[PDB]
């Protein structure tokens, strides 16, 4: 490459990073920042296990 | 000013310094690092006093 500070746009260097995921192929080990709670039972509720 | 990294030439910042001298007005005190040497006598030489 010929990167120079005088080069116009379309020739200045660019840093690129790509992130690749999977969707439910195994017990997931990379979760979000959500915090767990207690565990209720014998009631009609919604869960996020 | 609107200095942005994507700006083309003719808009990027430039740093400028100008130097001004005087000529033959007083005993000079600022000049290059010439190596002062020994002095000889009774010989046809060129001097830089």
């Amino acid at each position: 490459y010929g990167f120079q500070p005088t080069n116009g746009v379309g020739y200045q260097p660019y840093r690129v990073v790509v992130l690749s995921f999977e969707l439910l192929h195994a017990p997931a080990t990379v979760c979000g920042p959500k915090k767990s709670t207690n565990l209720v039972k014998n009631k009609c509720v919604n869960f996020n296990f």
Side-chain angles (χ1 to χ4, degrees), chain A:
Chain A
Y1 273 113
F3 292 126
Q4 276 269 358
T6 55
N7 303 152
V9 289
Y11 286 103
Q12 311 175 34
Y14 269 94
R15 282 182 182 205
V16 167
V17 289
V18 310
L19 297 172
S20 304
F21 301 106
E22 62 84 34
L23 277 297
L24 200 59
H25 302 75
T29 191
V30 185
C31 278
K34 293 297 299 316
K35 308 175 308 310
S36 295
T37 55
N38 56 79
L39 192 143
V40 303
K41 287 173 59 61
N42 299 114
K43 268 169 49 60
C44 178
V45 287
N46 60 5
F47 50 78
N48 195 345
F49 275 96

